[PDB]
Amino acid sequence: YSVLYNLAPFFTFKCYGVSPTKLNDLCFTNVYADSFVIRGDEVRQIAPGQTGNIADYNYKLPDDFTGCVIAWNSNKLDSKVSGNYNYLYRLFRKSNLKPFERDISTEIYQAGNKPCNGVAGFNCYFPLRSYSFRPTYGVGHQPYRVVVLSFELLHAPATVCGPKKSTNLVKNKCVNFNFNGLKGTGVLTESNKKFLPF
Amino acid sequence: QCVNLTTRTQLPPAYTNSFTRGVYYPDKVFRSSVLHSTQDLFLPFFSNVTWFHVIKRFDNPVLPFNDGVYFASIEKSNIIRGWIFGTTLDSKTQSLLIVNNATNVVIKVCEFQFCNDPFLDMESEFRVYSSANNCTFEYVSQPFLNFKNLREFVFKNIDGYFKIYSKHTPIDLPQGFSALEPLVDLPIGINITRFQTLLALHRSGWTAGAAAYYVGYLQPRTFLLKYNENGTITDAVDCALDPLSETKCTLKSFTVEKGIYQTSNFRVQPTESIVRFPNITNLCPFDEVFNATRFASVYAWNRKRISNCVAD
Amino acid sequence: DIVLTQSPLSLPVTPGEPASISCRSSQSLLRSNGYNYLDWYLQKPGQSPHLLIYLGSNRASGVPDRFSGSGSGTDFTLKISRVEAEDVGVYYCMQALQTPYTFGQGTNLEIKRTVAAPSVFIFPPSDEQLKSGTASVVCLLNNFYPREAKVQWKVDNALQSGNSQESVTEQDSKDSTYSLSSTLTLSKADYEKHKVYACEVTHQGLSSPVTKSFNRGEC
Amino acid sequence: QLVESGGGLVKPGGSLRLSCAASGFSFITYNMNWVRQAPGKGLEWVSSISSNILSSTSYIYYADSVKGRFTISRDDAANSLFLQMNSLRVEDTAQYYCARTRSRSVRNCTSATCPVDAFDLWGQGTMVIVSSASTKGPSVFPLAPSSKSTSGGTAALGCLVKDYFPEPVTVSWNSGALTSGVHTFPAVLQSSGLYSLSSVVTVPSSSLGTQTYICNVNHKPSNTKVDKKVEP
Ligand SMILES: *[C@@H]1O[C@H](CO)[C@@H](O)[C@H](O)[C@H]1NC(C)=O
Ligand SMILES: *[C@@H]1O[C@H](CO)[C@@H](O)[C@H](O)[C@H]1NC(C)=O
Ligand SMILES: *[C@@H]1O[C@H](CO)[C@@H](O)[C@H](O)[C@H]1NC(C)=O
Ligand SMILES: *[C@@H]1O[C@H](CO)[C@@H](O)[C@H](O)[C@H]1NC(C)=O
Ligand SMILES: *[C@@H]1O[C@H](CO)[C@@H](O)[C@H](O)[C@H]1NC(C)=O
Ligand SMILES: *[C@@H]1O[C@H](CO)[C@@H](O)[C@H](O)[C@H]1NC(C)=O
């Protein structure tokens, strides 16, 4: 947590969950990292328990997240001189979307009583609506990049801990110590013994 | 793509002994000039193990193995390639894959689709599976590789850790002592109850060289491991094989003096369970005391002495 | 295949009178659902073949309400409340059974003003064209409506074909009149072999065709 | 769809490159197709393709000849469509309309049958001609005025251009000062392929003896500018 943060783009790191200070001393198992781009003030819709267009039909967050989200603004890499209508989101749906689930099914919404067999008429519209991305828009329409990280404890054992940039260790001089996370009362003298590689 | 084999000739499996094989380091703890007794899944000494010989004989059997699989094989010209682990060996359950080509080893636990006769076939043919559905883990490591070589492997699945012990030495079971050092720890944390051996066939339809492998069982017991002055394991002693080794285990020494010694007690295990009951069952109207329309007040509670029924 | 013939398209249409154009079907237009998968496209010449009515008896793409479809099966036609000056273009019915579809035949709209008398111009070839070896004579039509006009070239009491080309201008935005250019190309050797050259213009606004004759060699 | 690129003279044994260019639109959610056109009655349909947002591998719709000769491709990352041609047997005129379909949803469509709703984004601006030789400079011939159709008081005179490539050409009278009676007619395609265009203007007969009429013929692709004076 020293290269992805502390950067030039504006960091919208206003999230609830794990402590940012405790991030460097946490060992989570099987974190899911998903990235998506939104338009303007839709950052608030990505929240646990939030109700909205994205939070009900596009990306629903469950009651428990065990973590939080990271968002940043990018009006240069997601904008063009002409219109940028290459990113779409679903707007029409019959039932609520399950949390932590994706349903890639673009079909005709039967809003009215008359069904439509793949032909959009008067009571049928395509659920997918396209975002508008231009460098001349205001804050409420700028392209925002949000990445979601969820920490959890699964059946997989602890293998994500890592070095965590531990900077320590001294010469012996009868100094009490800590061996591999367990405190020690002895001394770190030299050794003439030969160890196996394992 | 799978090719069925019809040239197999039916033969019963063979048997051979396990004189001084199956010993390995219990953990990564260094010891020197000590005789330490520990409890771990160990192959008992002088135990019969299954012998399979491949020559036109092909040996690719399936046998249930919950945990503790001992694999040893005399090997020349790299005939044995890999192993299969899983529960039902299909796409409905997670299975583990071990394949190494001439470059390096490949570890891929995944819900692979297995055929009836999976094998391997310069070597450029790879026909052991067809599809992958449900997996997210991949591991790639350093390659592990007349009779000239012996390859012994021990696999254990304890507390979600797939412990692999390996030992290769330059050379029936040879009469010698070798300690299988740990090789790699796999944090898969899955369930396995079956195994399958992958074999490589030389193309010249196909020709198979002379290669044999041994499969042994693992049992929970205690050994008396001896560590030399410079860390290597010298000898091991089973603590329940014969009374001399029981005395050696009790006295914590490899040599016992002349005299009478006491080790344990002779106990007789039970054979069958005998638990009956008065055949008559009377039952009780728990319904009239649980689903009762009227309940008495706290200051004056009703008391009923329920007797002569069964507790359902 | 599915090649079919539309209406004969030689229909005289006047303002205040509805125009019906009908194309039939070789087989039934019934696949998947029972919707009428038949289209009609308004291909006004010059820029783009736009559309007026999509599948079914519904309206889309901001089409004026004067155009409406009716009929199903092997029966289909259009109804126009009142033709305008901006409705000119070839017609086509688009059937939505399969993607390898064939095309029909279309002709531009015809509006009978019957008041604009044609002005016929004829220009003799210049001396520079005679020196170049190609004698080009042009018969022009000005301030005539509608676009259809039977223009033929007569040389020595003989009809000429295969050497005349006609170009029709677009409808003017000021007086709503068409113009037609008829250019005839002939070799110099054949040009000096004859004496009289003329063009005959036939239009519905004239009781008799207008024939004006000129002789080559005049200054 | 505003301007489609790809056009010029190509040998029958050569290759053709066709590309579409447009403005901001939901370009990845439409199953656009290709439609040809004839100068006479009866158009033609070249090929059809499906977007990758409705199907994982999309859908293929080919006829016989366009399968044997034509090829199609997509990009799914920009506003361009690819239409290659490895070989060309008989293709005189080809406009290749860049229209989409009015169907964001596709249902019950197999590999050889798919209903379509409407094409509402037809595109023009390209033209390919084979065996068209090379660009030829225009020749301008002045036509003497005749005071018969426009009566005695008015005379109509014009400038006729011959043997010019390609179709676009600019004709003006008195450097644009004269705007009364001017009428420019469209050209026609000759058997030899070389186009011819006419443009006449009507002026009163009293100004023939005192005003000079000069026509300006500008040809941008050939960089030819001819100023011809018309006299009776
Ligand atoms: C071989 O194994 C069998 C068990 O399958 C056992 O009964 C037999 O005693 C073994 N033979 C020897 C010589 O140990
Ligand atoms: C060995 O197997 C790995 C695993 O797929 C592969 O990447 C590599 O190319 C293989 N080497 C050869 C020589 O085929
Ligand atoms: C198997 O797939 C399901 C759904 O795709 C998923 O929920 C489950 O976690 C997968 N199994 C494993 C072991 O990841
Ligand atoms: C592993 O699977 C076998 C059979 O599939 C089953 O009997 C056993 O209980 C399983 N063990 C665990 C720990 O799930
Ligand atoms: C001492 O240890 C080294 C490596 O641990 C070994 O090579 C050597 O043989 C040992 N010494 C003796 C006398 O065995
Ligand atoms: C309680 O138990 C009786 C006896 O079986 C049953 O009939 C009744 O449905 C149960 N529930 C209630 C609410 O009385």
Numbering used by the authors:
A (entry chain A): 365 to 562
B (entry chain C): 14 to 68, 77 to 142, 153 to 176, 185 to 210, 215 to 247, 257 to 364
C (entry chain G): 1 to 219
D (entry chain F): 3 to 234
Sentences from the paper on this structure:
Investigation of memory B cells from patients primarily with breakthrough infections with the Delta variant enables isolation of a number of neutralizing antibodies cross-reactive to heterologous variants of concern (VOCs) including Omicron variants (BA.1-BA.4). To understand neutralizing activities of cross-neutralizing antibodies identified by our activity assays we determined the cryo-EM structures of the most potent YB9-258 and YB13-292 antibodies in complex with various spikes proteins.
Substitutions at 417 and 478, outside of the epitope, have very little effect. Modeling suggested that YB13-292 and ACE2 would not clash when bound to RBD. We found that while the HCDR2 insertions are not essential in neutralization of wildtype virus, addition of the complete 4 amino acid “SNIL” insertion is essential for YB13-292 and YB13-292 like antibodies to fully neutralize Delta and Omicron BA.1 variants. Together with interactions mediated by the “SNIL” insertion, these additional interactions likely render YB13-292 resistant to escape: single substitutions at 484, 452 and 490 are unable to abolish YB13-292 binding with primarily effects on antigen dissociation, explaining YB13-292’s ability to cross-neutralize Beta, Delta and Omicron BA.1 variants.
